[model samples]
Target chain A: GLLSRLRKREPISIYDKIGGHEAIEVVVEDFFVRVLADDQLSAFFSGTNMSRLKGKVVEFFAAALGGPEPYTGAPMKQVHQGRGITMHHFSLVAGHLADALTAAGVPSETITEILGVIAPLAVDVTS
Target chain B: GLLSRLRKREPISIYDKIGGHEAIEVVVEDFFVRVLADDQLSAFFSGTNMSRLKGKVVEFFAAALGGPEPYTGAPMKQVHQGRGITMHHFSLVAGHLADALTAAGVPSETITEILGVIAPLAVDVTSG
Candidate 1:
């Protein structure tokens, strides 16, 4: 449950080891709460299909975490193109996810290492 | 909400940075659900003052995570002095907690760091 649980130097993909759908549900629910809370980013949500968007995110996170082989949604940049996303908005979303995971008890070391894998998504999604 | 949120190895108390009472609630709720659901441990909870125990745990966890200074309760060893707890029971509790946190989106990194801070309690409470 702590640093002791981390299999240091283990080559396994952390995403693969997570509890799959059960684990992803919490992250998605908690992560979106923060995404919608940000004033800067909230506007983009207006008129956006939130329920459908939520579904999309489930797959998005899963794919990013190495859950599946293919994600059919538009490329991240294409999805946000002309929507005026910035680093601030990106960071806000990232912060909520980190906060959510911390609240849930994911190991900090695993979080750090996993974030390394997901960081590139920030670059791809943000202008 | 993962490592990017960690303040680059800051000297801050990891527990203090948590969302205070709000955070403890989720962990407590999630942790106990597993405790009560486990057949091996559920029997021990029979007739126990669950609500009161839950309240105490909020404080217990908060204190463990550096939530506050004055917990005003028994030490871990004394609390379980006669309960006949063992490592298997202890690990079950810890595993549920880990599973619960991951479900809620706590980054794996913070989870590990926190478990380290709280692990001593397992020793303090279990048969030494």
Candidate 2:
């Protein structure tokens, strides 16, 4: 029954479904906009060029979402491994992300769902 | 122009857009079904019960995907730390996921995209 219902809903290819690279670019821009504004998350992004960071993030998401683009950034763990991102900091980042998603008009339910998917990463991300 | 194009597309919430908990359940089920069948990754789920494992996975994804549900599972690194998940292993997992997505009729392009999002996790998931 459940699978059947899911099957009925139109399947979206990452590009068409996510609005291609353009859509991803907006989401990433919005995400960083919120991140840069937040006192807690801002430090992580300090001194980083907004444009470059935005481009990398877009590339990263593009690859992950199913686009032909490839992500060349450092490994997730290696990049943040020793950065002192404790659980408390992780929670703060999540909150900041929620704020960004809301500002971007992502449905509240969808924001929650995306957070849920990312929540599992805390175990690995937090010190 | 790019921003405008993105603005015009409908933004679906995780629940409504992705088919809610039931849809999540199916995706997770399909993923594990393939994982269990794979000789390389089966070792990780060797002793785990399929039913309970499936439920936990659904809950886990639900929380991460933005559902109100909170994941109670162990941290990702702790669960995977020192478990011998090399880059090769991570690549295998990704490959298996791609297979599962295709089997479930997830469009090829979408699979590539999903893999991209999950790709960053590889660095963290592998042994430190």
Candidate 3:
């Protein structure tokens, strides 16, 4: 049913296309593991409260994916301004997230769509 | 004549558009000062051989600007592979260079064209 829905030409939100909040949770969990293991991105997560970070990430993704949940976090620019995050780090994080999405059985096209939405966040996240 | 040549837009090279070898030396010197002063970029320059770096930079830009000098330095990818240069660092360097060129009284359109040629080198430089 979901596959059929995905095949349809109609515009469906990424949240629905990727199987909603539950899938978001799984992807974000795997995403965190990958990011935390990455040497470049890991440095930023150091001294970060991972639990709080995880919650925010989930919220942020949920909003990005057009889920019902609104992102209740601080502005991306403010959160990342002093963090020394670069475009390289941003690209690495995006790659990790893309892989994480793939590992969760999300389709390639949907992941492409997801990344399209996520890519513009670089400007704010990069200082 | 040079200004008129630029105004005519008969496919002149960036080297000619931006003045040539002498102007390149001036721009690169000022660019180094700006890049070296930047905290993010300064770290990359620490312990570096300024003389050698300047030479490579001049050769690299000279070729990129379509000058007579062939770039005889090590491959950019090979030289920058191990460096922790990121797109952010590359962008900062580009901006500093742009400013340096501007300070040297290079035209805005020429600077834009110069950066267009320089921007693609980022893929080779970023490792992390």
Candidate 4:
């Protein structure tokens, strides 16, 4: 039932519906900038090349949010598998992401709904 | 520097060490039950109540792991602020948890590693 319903539902890819790759890129760039400033989770992205990370993050979200792009990066769990990320780390990241989305002028309800879908992934990203 | 190595580091509460409140419990339980039956994750729990969902997963691992009996509960963002839960409606819940440890039955690392720790939270009870 769920599958049929989902299939018949209009395929409004977030990238397309939210103004395609450019819009997503802007949001992600802003998002990472905020992440870098976060004291709790900043170390995770520390010393990493911002441009490369931004590209990968955009690609990840593009594919993840029902877009046509394919995310070839490491599986989320394996990427952070042994890292000692705790719930607090995850909270900080989410908070920053939400703030970024808001600042970028994305609708509040859309941002909240999108976050809900992504929330369960905490298990994979954090320890 | 980083809160002075975490202030002598003995608050002993993942319940408190991680953060305070029962918020972590509700989120962890929901996440675990989903992981229990997941095609990718189900085998981790198979048929266990996995329901040890309460009593702070971190706490179980804390004293068991060598911290104090202080894990008020588990931690995170998606569940707390409720964001980035993946694009799929039924995204697989990830993160290393006690289920993986119990399923393996390895030597108690924390208790054994520390001199006075106790592995007290290893399924003391299970009910359907």
lDDT (Cα, 0-100) at B52 in candidate 2: 79
- Please state the Cα-based DockQ of model 1 relative to the true two-chain complex: 0.02
> Candidate 4 lDDT, tens digit per residue, A73-101?
44567567777999888888888878887
Best by lDDT: 3
Candidate DockQ scores, in order: 0.02, 0.02, 0.01, 0.02
Interface RMSD of 4: 13.1
Docking class of 1: incorrect
Error of 3 at A40 (Å): 40
**Chain B alone, TM-score, model 1:** 0.82
Docking category of candidate 4:
incorrect
| lDDT for position B100 in model 2 | 52
Question: How much is A68 displaced in model 2, in angstroms?
Answer: 23
Comparing 3 and 4 on lDDT, the stronger one: 3
Off by over 4 Å in 3: A1-127, B1-10
Q: Write the per-residue lDDT of candidate 1 for residues B6-66, one digit (tens) a residue.
A: 4576444555565667777877887788788766778878878887888788887777776
lDDT of 2 by residue, A1-127 (tens): 2234348774543434445678767787777777778787788877888898788767766665555545644335534766788888888777876777677666687667667766777886777
Candidate scoring better on TM-score of 2 and 3: 3
Q: In candidate 4 chain A, where is summed lDDT lowest over 10 consecutive residues?
A: A66-75
| CAPRI tier for the interface of model 2 | incorrect
Question: TM-score of A-chain in each prediction?
Answer: 0.82, 0.71, 0.89, 0.85
Candidate 2 on B1-128: residue-level lDDT in tens? Answer: 22343488845434344455876777777677656665667897767788976777678766655466678777777777888888887887777566555544555776676676678887778984
What C-alpha lDDT values do all the predictions have? 0.71, 0.67, 0.83, 0.56
